[PDB]
């Protein structure tokens, strides 16, 4: 499964492996639950080239602060361990595929 669970301790190691799309969220979130099945569709559609890295902002304020994340769901596209793009809020799988594609 392409989807992984990380913290500030592991985030950089996980995001080093190619294009990775991190999901700054928290289980207390509402809108994040809408995009979760879209990330499962992304496992099913991009998991050959993509990794998806969920990170719980309620325990990872430092990593959130690293990019000024102040709302969720927030999406950080990293490539080879550094941020390459950002997006905020819900997006459909096609728009997310394009957001990945522009850095593949």
How many H/I helices?
A: 4
What would you report as the Rg, rounded to the nearest angstrom? 12 Å
CATH topology: Glutaredoxin
The biggest beta sheet is recorded as: 5 strands, mixed
Q: Provide the β-strand percentage band.
A: 25-35%
Residues in helix, %: 25-40%
CATH architecture: 3-Layer(aba) Sandwich
- Going across the biggest sheet, name each strand in turn: 1-3-2-4-5
Find the count of extended strands (DSSP E, 2+ residues): 5
Strand-pairing-aware structural class: alpha/beta
Number of domains: 1
- CATH H-level superfamily title: Glutaredoxin
Q: What's the CATH C level?
A: Alpha Beta
Distance between the termini: 19 Å
Order of secondary-structure elements:
EHEHEHEEH
Shape: globular
Describe the protein.
- One of its GO terms (cellular component) is cytoplasm.
- Participates in various redox reactions through the reversible oxidation of its active center dithiol to a disulfide and catalyzes dithiol-disulfide exchange reactions.
- Belongs to the thioredoxin family.
- InterPro entries: Thioredoxin (IPR005746), Thioredoxin-like_sf (IPR036249), Thioredoxin_CS (IPR017937), Thioredoxin_domain (IPR013766).
- The chain has helices at residues 11-15, 31-46, 61-66, 93-101, and strands at 3-6, 19-25, 51-56, 74-79, 82-88.
- The protein is α/β, with parallel strands linked by helices and 104 residues long.
- The chain has a single domain (1-104), classed as Glutaredoxin.
- A 5-stranded mixed beta sheet has the order 1-3-2-4-5.
- α2 links the parallel β2 and β3.
């Amino acid at each position: 499964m392409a989807i992984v669970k990380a913290t500030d301790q592991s985030f950089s190691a996980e995001t080093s492996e190619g294009v990775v799309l991190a999901d700054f969220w928290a289980p207390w979130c509402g809108p994040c639950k809408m995009i979760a099945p879209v990330l499962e569709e992304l496992d099913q559609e991009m998991g050959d080239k993509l990794k998806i890295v969920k990170i719980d902002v309620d325990e990872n304020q430092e990593t959130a602060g690293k990019y000024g994340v102040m709302s969720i769901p927030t999406l950080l596209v990293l490539k080879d361990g550094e941020v390459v793009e950002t997006s905020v809020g819900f997006k459909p799988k096609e728009a997310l595929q394009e957001l990945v594609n522009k850095h593949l």
